[PDB]
Write a structure and sequence with these properties.
Chain H: Keywords: Cytoplasm, Pheromone response, Phosphoprotein, Signal transduction inhibitor. The structure is cut from a larger assembly and holds two copies of chain A, one copy of chain B (about 50 residues), four copies of chain C, one copy of chain D (about 525 residues) and one copy of chain H (about 190 residues). Chain C has about 45 residues and is mostly helical. Helix content of chain C is about 40%, strand content about 0%. The radius of gyration of chain D is 30 Å and the shape is elongated. Classes of the chains: A mainly alpha (about 120), B alpha+beta (about 50), C mainly alpha (about 45), D alpha+beta (about 525), H alpha/beta (about 190). Strand 2 of chain D pairs parallel with strand 5 of chain I, so a sheet runs across the interface. One adenosine-5'-diphosphate sits at the interface of chains I and F.
Chain lengths: ~120, ~50, ~45, ~525, ~120, ~100, ~50, ~190, ~140
């Protein structure tokens, strides 16, 4: 299992950013687009919960880069602690994996389309 | 290439074999490219666009 | 948290998005007319 | 860009919301006049076949009226299932659900509180309300005299809003006596509603035994003393033999005449099997042909044909016997007995009246009135009364009515409003004002001042006493135990639970997607 | 039939109610193919009345031999058949969907009989 | 029918006079209930069969139809039709 | 009686009754059997 | 124009022989071979001819599979009858099925009790006549007040079969077109 | 057409006699019982002193339409005829009413204008129940 709720996403994100730095050229900018694309999920949870996305995103990026513990995410119910060990939240690995696989595999098909013919009914 | 026929069913493809099959061609001269594409698809199965 | 201000209004940000896309549509029409490699536009 | 298609209405976060609330206001203002004892009945005119319908029940008003609003369809369905569960109190669900959204409209606009925060206040407020409703109840059924009196008060409280409000002193005896005759069996199919034109509303009389709209045969007598009753789900019709696929091959018509003789001898032996018991009447589910009908003449047996499926169980339970079809073994299947089998006439249609049966587990409510619209109101009125009193047999706990249940529930909600920090405490108070708005509406329909009686009732109950209520006849506060106003515990529990879920569904909305109609 | 008891409990031993599940309903036996039964003079007409009357007697003895307490079929029983079950304190449900019939046997640790001649104690619920 | 419309005409002006409809409705039910008791004192009982009263009552009760002037022989026809069915319990005589 | 399902009379049956000087009628309503039986005092017949 | 078409169109294989001496052989025999082939097709399609008293398990096959027939879209019409012996109209409709079954052998005539057909279907609703064709319900007919009610006749039932497309309008088996021999005899004398 | 009228006409004659055999009461006609109920309730109304009494005055006034309608159909002046109904009823307690043949007021029992009490009872009773149902209506909403 994993621990989602922005945690997973934030983790993934810092990972990608470091790797992006280890990459030079047209590829780095990409990796950066994949990093910022993963950040939209916890920012959406921060937007719906009313918390500031600036303080929320900056705290997760700064904290997760410092500490190696990767189960801290966006607390939407307004608790005082963001550590998800105490909040009783668990998600499966096969479920969170398919979000990235079916998304990145679809968008390859969406980007390849050049000619778009729509026969009016 | 994204094609949508009159029956409103999407069909996305890269090879020219089924793209030309979806577009019902009226002109006989343009049907020559469609016949060789299906013939190349039937015989070999590669190079239908080239 | 629950005490946060919802602000009751999503129509303003949607109208601003409609204006930005409408403004970027015509801005991208004349993007290829800049520099020595620009192209003329006959209207 | 355009994402839905042609002729598709879409709304986003300011047209989506405030379209359901105004729909909740639109559906609530209709049923506002129908609430209470002094409420006015609404008349529904159909669009086709010029069919009119006079009805006071909020569920039936919403059944017939078309409503294309999606938010109003939620109120249409919750009144339907509330009529399915209890049968009474559908108007209170629609009023309380609309006023909860009316208050929440102000909390979203004025106080600027998130919708999810409003629900969290309603969860704690609803829990405190049901806990006060559980503690405010009182046990019953230990003394049959008190259980008899409480059903009379529940029948008076239910029929006070319907057309039987003036004659509820007489109809309360008719309503409560039929329920005690059920012997615990909770089912409404055992009660018949016979429509008779003529007379006045108070002419409805309690029947001893069971009465139905059937008729004797052509040759049968009028009166038989101490008649044994039998019920056949049989086919005394052209029986055929059931191995469908039988045909008759005939070489000569000599044996075909003897074959038809065997068919008449086959049914003769079947009617001879009936006479082994020595019954005095014979009740069949379907039509009886003439040749069986002539055979009951010399044997001294009455005949009743074309009995409904419900009428079989409704007559068998009063008789006490069981439905028999084989007629093979006379040892088992002991039949009942009835003293008076003489029919009577009420109007232009004769009805077979029975009297002096073994058991009265099924009943029949004879009604008299002027217009069929009044009889339809009489049917729906007593159906709500008998439905509430029937479920009171299985669920014993009750609660005081007259608006005291709403205010005593809001007392614990207001008590638990102070110790809750955050912005949801205002939503907890919004739930309290929703409970207060029900007795505010009871005073409006009666034509008296609402702010004074609500203020006097609210200040009186916080002093320490919890038996006060609204007396709309005199227009002042009085003791509900003296007037004898009490309702069931499951009714108000279902109303508060359904109204809490009603506001929860419509408050979790942000967009409306209305596809193209067929 | 609505006169049957609502709640059915077990008696002194064999706490399982022995739920018998059936595919073929309480009906006269006949083949699928089109057929016409040639009925002769009055001797054969009176004989077939005893045939079906002995069939129901053979039917109720077969169920009581198996010792079932609840019987369910996918199709409705005949009328006469609805009363014959009610006499021996043997309730029945009728018209149980075909897709719904298979799920009942799995929970009850039983198996559906194809016909009534193979009915025995081991295959009851 | 005539009377009803008349009482609705009485209730028409009473609605303008600031009286509730339920008070107007209950007043007619109490007034109608008293009206029955007044006629029960005024009505006179008759015998089981009386040609002087029944024939004259049947003729003067039709009073509007085409056969009212033919009632010299049809009013005895109606009395003789019902008198064949007689009972002391005052049953509802069926016209079948 | 009316007897829409099975033929009430035919030319053969009318001929035998014509010699015996017996009148016959058809198209009798099922509801009027009570009136004819109780009026004329004749019980119905449904078997020979 | 119609005078030339009435020689062939308005004469069956038995009536076409009248024009053997008058009309040309090649003109007549060319059409007789055509009409003879049509008669052979009806004989092969005559898979029925008596009322199929069925039961439910079977409905899922007899009523519907048949309606598909060969599935050459060889569709087959299947008239179902939800019988109820207590009703008077049901026994009348059962007689019409056996009468029509002896004539129209290509059309399937199905009968079943209404109590065994649908769970708790109202008894009042039946006698119910359903017409299947290629698995689809062509007509869900209600009680026979439309077809005269208690006074329903064989002529009214045959007219209903023409409306649903089960029998052609100019079919020689229909009583509307099947004029009596005495009727045609008077026409020839008065001609 | 008149044969259909003669059927329902004789149905009224059998039904009127059916009212007499089921209930032995017999009262006069020709505007007799309508004025009696309005006269007897007028004395009882003034002694009550309430808003219910004011409704009973209109109940007594609206009940006088039956002899008023008889005056208009006969062509006589309603006020002159109804004035005679008031002048003769304080002494004549019953059987005083209108006779159409002479076109005036006379003793109806001598002229043999009688009717059952159940007819007038059902008229006053059913009329009050119909007004009870109509006045409770507040809205006219279209439905399916
Ligand atoms: N109580 C909670 N605390 C923290 N995170 C939560 C909580 N509830 C839900 N989440 C997060 O919000 C996400 C919401 O997913 P959900 O909306 O239920 O699935 P879907 O998006 O398919 O409808 C989850 O992946 C989870 O990580
Ligand atoms: N990995 C590669 N590197 C370079 N050239 C390639 C590669 N793969 C394919 N090609 C060339 O590009 C062309 C691709 O043909 P393409 O249109 O992709 O497939 P098809 O011809 O079957 O539709 C071929 O002519 C091939 O010579
Ligand atoms: N006689 C009465 N006196 C005071 N209040 C009453 C009386 N009868 C009913 N009520 C009040 O009317 C409210 C709703 O009554 P109810 O029977 O549910 O009407 P409806 O069936 O139209 O919803 C109850 O909450 C009750 O307190
Ligand atoms: N011969 C008569 N003279 C005076 N008044 C009559 C006579 N016959 C009937 N009436 C009056 O006419 C009124 C209406 O009677 P009628 O028209 O016969 O009622 P319906 O036709 O509805 O039975 C009665 O109230 C009665 O008093
Ligand atoms: Mg390739
Ligand atoms: Mg109520
Ligand atoms: Mg009259």
């Amino acid at each position: 299992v994993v621990y989602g709720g922005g945690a997973a996403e934030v983790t993934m994100s810092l990972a990608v950013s470091e790797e992006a730095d280890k990459q030079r050229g047209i590829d780095q900018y990409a990796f950066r687009g994949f990093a910022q694309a993963l950040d939209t999920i916890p920012m959406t949870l921060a937007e719906n919960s009313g918390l500031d996305p600036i303080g929320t995103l900056s705290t997760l990026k700064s904290k997760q880069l410092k500490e190696k513990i990767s189960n801290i995410g966006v607390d939407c119910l307004g608790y005082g602690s963001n550590d998800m060990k105490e909040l009783f939240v668990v998600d499966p690995f096969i479920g969170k994996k398919q979000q990235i696989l079916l998304a990145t595999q679809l968008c390859r098909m969406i980007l390849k389309i050049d000619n778009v013919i729509i026969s009016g009914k | 290439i994204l094609i949508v026929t009159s029956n409103q069913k999407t069909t996305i493809s890269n090879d020219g074999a089924t793209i030309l099959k979806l577009l019902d061609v009226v002109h006989p001269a343009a049907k020559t490219l469609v016949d060789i594409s299906r013939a190349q698809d039937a015989e070999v199965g590669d190079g239908t666009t080239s | 948290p629950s005490n946060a201000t919802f602000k009751n209004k999503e129509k303003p940000q949607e109208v601003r998005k409609a204006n930005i896309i409408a403004a970027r549509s015509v801005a991208d029409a004349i993007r290829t007319s800049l520099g020595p490699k620009g192209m003329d536009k006959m209207i | 860009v355009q994402i839905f298609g042609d002729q598709v209405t879409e709304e986003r976060a300011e047209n989506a919301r405030l379209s359901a609330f105004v729909g909740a206001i639109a559906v609530g203002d209709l049923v506002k006049s129908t609430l209470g004892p002094k409420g006015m009945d609404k008349l529904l005119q159909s669009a086709s076949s010029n069919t009119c319908m006079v009805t006071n029940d909020g569920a039936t008003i919403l059944k017939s009226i078309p409503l294309d609003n999606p938010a109003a369809k939620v109120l249409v369905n919750i009144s339907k299932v509330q009529d399915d569960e209890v049968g009474d109190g559908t108007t209170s669900v629609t009023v309380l659900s609309a006023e909860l959204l009316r208050e929440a409209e102000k909390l979203i606009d004025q106080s600027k509180i998130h919708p999810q925060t409003i629900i969290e206040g309603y969860r704690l407020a609803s829990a405190a309300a049901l806990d006060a409703l559980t503690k405010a109840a009182v046990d019953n059924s230990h003394d049959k005299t008190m259980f008899r009196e409480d059903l009379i008060h529940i029948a008076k409280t239910t029929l006070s809003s319907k057309i039987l409000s003036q004659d509820k002193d007489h109809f309360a005896e008719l309503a409560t006596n039929a329920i005690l005759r059920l012997k615990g069996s909770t089912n409404l199919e055992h009660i018949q509603i016979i429509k008779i034109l003529g007379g006045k509303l108070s002419d409805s009389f309690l029947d001893e035994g069971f009465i139905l709209a059937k008729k004797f045969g052509n040759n049968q007598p009028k009166r038989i003393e101490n008649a044994k009753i039998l019920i056949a789900n049989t086919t005394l019709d052209t029986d055929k033999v059931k191995i469908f696929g039988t045909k008759f091959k005939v070489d000569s018509t000599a044996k075909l005449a003897q074959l038809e003789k065997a068919e008449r001898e086959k049914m003769k032996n079947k009617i001879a099997k009936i006479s082994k018991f020595g019954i005095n009447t014979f009740i069949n589910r379907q039509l009886i042909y003439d040749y069986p009908e002539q055979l009951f003449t010399d044997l001294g047996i009455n005949s009743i044909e074309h009995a409904d499926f419900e009428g079989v169980e409704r007559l068998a339970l009063v008789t006490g016997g069981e439905v028999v079809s084989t007629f093979d073994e006379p040892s088992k299947c002991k039949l009942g007995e009835c003293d008076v089998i003489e029919e009577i006439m009420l109007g232009e249609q004769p009805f077979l009246k029975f009297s002096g049966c073994k058991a009265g587990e099924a009943c029949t409510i004879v009604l008299r009135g002027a217009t069929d619209q009044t009889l339809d109101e009489a049917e729906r009125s007593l159906h709500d009364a008998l439905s509430v009193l029937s479920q009171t047999t299985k669920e014993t706990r009750t609660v005081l009515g007259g608006g005291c249940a709403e205010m005593v529930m809001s007392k614990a909600v207001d008590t638990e409003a102070q110790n809750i920090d955050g912005k949801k405490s205002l939503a907890v108070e919004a739930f309290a004002r929703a409970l207060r708005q029900l007795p505010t509406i009871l005073a409006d329909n009666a034509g008296f001042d609402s702010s004074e009686l609500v203020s006097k009732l609210r200040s009186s109950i916080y002093n320490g006493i919890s038996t006060s209520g609204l007396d709309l006849n005199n227009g002042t506060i009085a003791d509900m135990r003296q007037l004898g106003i009490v309702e069931s515990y499951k009714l108000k529990r279902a109303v508060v639970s359904s109204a809490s879920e009603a506001a929860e569904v419509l408050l979790r909305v942000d967009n409306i997607i209305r596809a193209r109609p067929r | 039939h609505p006169q049957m008891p609502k709640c059915v409990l077990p008696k002194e031993g064999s706490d399982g109610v022995k739920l018998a599940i059936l595919t073929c309903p309480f009906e006269p036996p006949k083949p699928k193919t089109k057929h016409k039964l040639d009925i002769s003079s009055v001797e054969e007409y009176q004989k077939l009345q005893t045939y079906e009357q002995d069939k129901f007697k053979e039917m109720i003895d077969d169920v009581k031999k198996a010792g079932a307490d609840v019987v369910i079929c996918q199709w409705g029983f005949d009328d006469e058949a609805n009363h014959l079950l009610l006499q021996n304190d043997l309730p029945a449900v009728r018209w149980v969907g075909g897709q719904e019939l298979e799920h009942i046997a799995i929970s009850t640790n039983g198996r559906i009989v194809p016909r009534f001649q193979d009915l025995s104690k081991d295959k009851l619920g | 029918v005539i009377l009803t419309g008349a009482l609705l005409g009485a209730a028409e002006r009473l609605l303008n006079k600031g009286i509730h409809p339920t008070i107007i409705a209950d007043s007619f039910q109490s007034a109608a209930k008293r009206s029955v008791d007044i006629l029960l004192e005024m009505c006179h009982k008759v015998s089981l069969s009386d040609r002087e009263q029944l024939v004259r009552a049947a003729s003067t009760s039709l009073s509007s139809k085409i056969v009212s002037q033919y009632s010299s022989f049809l009013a005895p026809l109606a009395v003789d039709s019902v008198l064949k069915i007689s009972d002391e319990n005052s049953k509802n005589v069926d016209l079948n | 009686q009316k007897s829409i399902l099975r033929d009430a009379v035919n030319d053969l049956a009318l001929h035998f009754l014509s010699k015996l000087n017996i009148m016959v009628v058809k198209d009798i309503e099922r509801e009027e059997i009570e009136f004819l039986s109780k009026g004329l005092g004749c019980k119905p017949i449904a078997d020979i | 124009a119609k005078q030339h078409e009435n020689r062939l169109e308005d004469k069956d294989l038995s009536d076409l022989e009248e024009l053997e001496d008058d009309e040309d052989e090649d003109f007549l025999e060319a059409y007789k071979i055509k009409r003879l082939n049509e008669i052979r097709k009806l004989q092969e399609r005559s898979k029925f001819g008596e009322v199929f008293h069925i039961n439910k398990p079977e409905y899922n096959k007899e009523v519907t599979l048949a309606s598909q027939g060969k599935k050459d879209d060889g569709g087959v019409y299947v008239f179902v009858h939800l019988s109820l012996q207590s009703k008077l109209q049901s026994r009348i409709l059962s007689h019409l099925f056996q009468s029509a079954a002896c004539k129209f052998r290509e059309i399937k005539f199905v009968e079943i009790p209404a109590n065994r057909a649908i769970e708790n279907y109202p008894e009042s609703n039946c006698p119910t006549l359903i017409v299947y064709y290629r698995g689809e319900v062509i007509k869900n007919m209600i009680t026979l007040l439309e077809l005269g009610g208690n006074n329903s006749k064989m002529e009214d039932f045959e007219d209903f079969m023409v409306k649903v497309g089960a029998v052609a309008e100019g079919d020689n088996r229909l009583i509307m077109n099947r004029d009596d021999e005495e009727s045609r005899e008077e026409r020839k004398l008065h001609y | 057409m008149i044969i259909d009228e003669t059927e329902r006409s004789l149905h009224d004659a059998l039904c009127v006699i059916r009212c007499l055999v089921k209930e032995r009461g017999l009262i006069a006609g020709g505007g007799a019982p309508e004025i009696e109920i309005s006269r007897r309730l007028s004395k009882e109304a003034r002694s009550m002193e309430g808003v219910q009494a004011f409704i009973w005055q209109e109940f007594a006034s609206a009940l006088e339409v039956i002899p008023t309608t008889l005056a208009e159909n006969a062509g006589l002046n309603s006020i002159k005829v109804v004035t005679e109904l008031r002048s003769k009823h304080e002494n004549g307690e019953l059987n005083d009413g209108i006779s159409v043949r002479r076109s005036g007021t006379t003793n109806t029992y001598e002229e043999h204008i009688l009717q059952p009490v159940l007819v007038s009872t059902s008229a006053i009773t059913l009329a009050s129940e119909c007004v009870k149902s109509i006045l409770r209506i507040d809205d006219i909403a279209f439905s399916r």
